[PDB]
């Protein structure tokens, strides 16, 4: 029923919202260490090369 | 508003948001709703 479906849909909306947030939060952490390793490669290019 | 109508006793449960049935789907459909539903059995004034 429409009332019974809305109860079990919010379980899928909340489940997948926390599945997207957990993905984006980890991409921000990964991209912070790629930038750290990309600032180092730009320093090696300027100084070693 | 105040909608007053007579329904069968076993169909009173169908007077509620989101339900389906003969009364709910073809006679009186509540929105899926702020309000109070009041139902008192009345067989002395109707049944004959």
From Swiss-Prot, chain B:
The organism of origin for this protein: Severe acute respiratory syndrome coronavirus 2 (2019-nCoV)
The name this protein goes by in its record: Spike protein S1
Oligomeric and partner information: Binds to host ACE2. RBD also interacts with the N-linked glycan on 'Asn-90' of ACE2. Cleavage of S generates a polybasic C-terminal sequence on S1 that binds to host Neuropilin-1 (NRP1) and Neuropilin-2 (NRP2) receptors. Interacts with host integrin alpha-5/beta-1 (ITGA5:ITGB1) and with ACE2 in complex with integrin alpha-5/beta-1 (ITGA5:ITGB1). May interact via cytoplasmic c-terminus with M protein. May interact (via N-terminus) with host bilirubin and biliverdin, thereby preventing antibody binding to the SARS-CoV-2 spike NTD via an allosteric mechanism.
Described purpose of this protein according to its UniProt entry: Attaches the virion to the cell membrane by interacting with host receptor, initiating the infection. The major receptor is host ACE2. When S2/S2' has been cleaved, binding to the receptor triggers direct fusion at the cell membrane. When S2/S2' has not been cleaved, binding to the receptor results in internalization of the virus by endocytosis using host TFRC and GRM2 and leading to fusion of the virion membrane with the host endosomal membrane. Alternatively, may use NRP1/NRP2 and integrin as entry receptors.
Region (Integrin-binding motif): 8-10
């Amino acid at each position: 029923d429409p009332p019974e479906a809305e109860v079990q849909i919010d379980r899928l909306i909340t489940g997948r919202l926390q599945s997207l947030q957990t993905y984006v939060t980890q991409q921000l952490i990964r991209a912070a260490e790629i930038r750290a390793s990309a600032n180092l490669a730009a320093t090696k290019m300027s100084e070693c090369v | 508003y105040a909608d007053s109508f007579v329904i069968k006793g076993n169909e009173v449960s169908q007077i509620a948001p989101g339900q389906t049935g003969n009364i709910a789907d073809y006679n009186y459909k509540l929105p899926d709703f702020t309000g109070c539903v009041i139902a008192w059995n009345s067989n002395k004034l109707d049944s004959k």
